[PDB]
Amino acid sequence: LDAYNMMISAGFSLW
Amino acid sequence: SMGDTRPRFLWQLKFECHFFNGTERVRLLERCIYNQEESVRFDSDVGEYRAVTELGRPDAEYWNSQKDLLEQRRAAVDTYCRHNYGVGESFTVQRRVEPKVTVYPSKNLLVCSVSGFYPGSIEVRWFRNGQEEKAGVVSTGLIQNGDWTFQTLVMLETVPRSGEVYTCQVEHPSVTSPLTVEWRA
Amino acid sequence: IKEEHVIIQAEFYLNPDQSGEFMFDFDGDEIFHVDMAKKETVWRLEEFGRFASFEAQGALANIAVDKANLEIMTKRSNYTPITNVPPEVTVLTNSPVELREPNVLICFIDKFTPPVVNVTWLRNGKPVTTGVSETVFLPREDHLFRKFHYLPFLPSTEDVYDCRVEHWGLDEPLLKHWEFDA
């Protein structure tokens, strides 16, 4: 079956 | 535990794919929300992140310094939005569920109940001896049941007279001809 | 200009509860969510799982990033906590009620945040602890939440119902009453 794709969260800068 | 009054801190991330005329026009909005305030977003009509509040300014600056992230976001109207549109097209966009229509008196008020339909676009009209009635019509509005069906009540205030026939007519994409229910009193 | 459909991937992380959520929405209806305990995809309609797939592992990885981001953002805001917004509650039924014909009571809880709520069905005052379905927290454009709870039942004039809702934004438990007016 075809899969839904997902957007990946973008990490903040630690500093 | 009882007496839990500790402060709460909420972070929400939303990726919204907006589709206009099929997939001909597509817009991606990536939204970052702290508590109840959106702080930074990526809008595909812009092509870079923008601070929505001052507290999102660091992230917009940092993310806009990343060529990989930006290129991935800029491509996402195709690789994510259009992709997922096609994945679910047959059982979402093209989902059609026919309503069940019943008519019953409320205790001067005739109720047309239209139950269990999908999608939400529907026309529900009242007729008295074939003449459409508009002035005395009131509705619940469109009710989303949460289970991929809708319902509505469309009610007609009337002074029924013997021999009159009232008809509730429903037009909906699930049927090729209108559904009709009569009430004769 | 004419917006036909919207698909939303909505996720959240909440501290100090350590609660997360990951779901997809199509035109206001949930397509699926990831159960965070069982760590699996849960399709809103079971048959969707015969038509498409989704890999829940990537959802869980997003939740890890969301938790880290939340902690950074909490520090950056000088630990500004969320303002409670209390729910508004509506009780309805799946279809017009008929004596002893099976139906469903629907408790719709709307316009609230944070996404933590206690919802109890009461029949003649007594909690109905079993048989209740419930959705995850559904997103709103104002970034509040909504939620559905469902109770299959046999309508009777012998039985009154209350949907009892607790939330930090409420001064007392909110009770929405429902009776069968035969």
Author numbering:
A (entry chain C): 1 to 15
B (entry chain B): -1 to 105, 113 to 190
C (entry chain A): 1 to 182
Can I see the authors' text?
In summary, each peptide bound HLA-DR1 canonically in the “forward” orientation that is described for HLA-DR,48 excluding CLIP. We observed little deviation in the overall structure of HLA-DR1 irrespective of bound peptide, particularly within the peptide binding groove, where the solved diversity of bound peptides had little impact on the position of the HLA-DR1 residues that lined each pocket.
nsp146420–6434 was identified as an HLA-DR1 peptide epitope in HLA-DR1+ transgenic mice and HLA-DR1+ exposed individuals (16/30; 53%) and individuals with no known exposure (3/10; 30%).18 Exhibiting strong binding to HLA-DR1 (IC50 = 541 nM), the structure of nsp146420–6434 was solved at 1.6 Å resolution in space group P 65 2 2 with a single copy in the asymmetric unit. The incorporation of P9-Phe was reminiscent of the similar S486–505 (also P9-Phe), which bound HLA-DR1 at weak affinity. TCR-facing residues were highly aliphatic (P−1-Ala, P3-Met, P5-Ile, P7-Ala, P8-Gly, and P11-Leu), the exception being the polar P2-Asn.
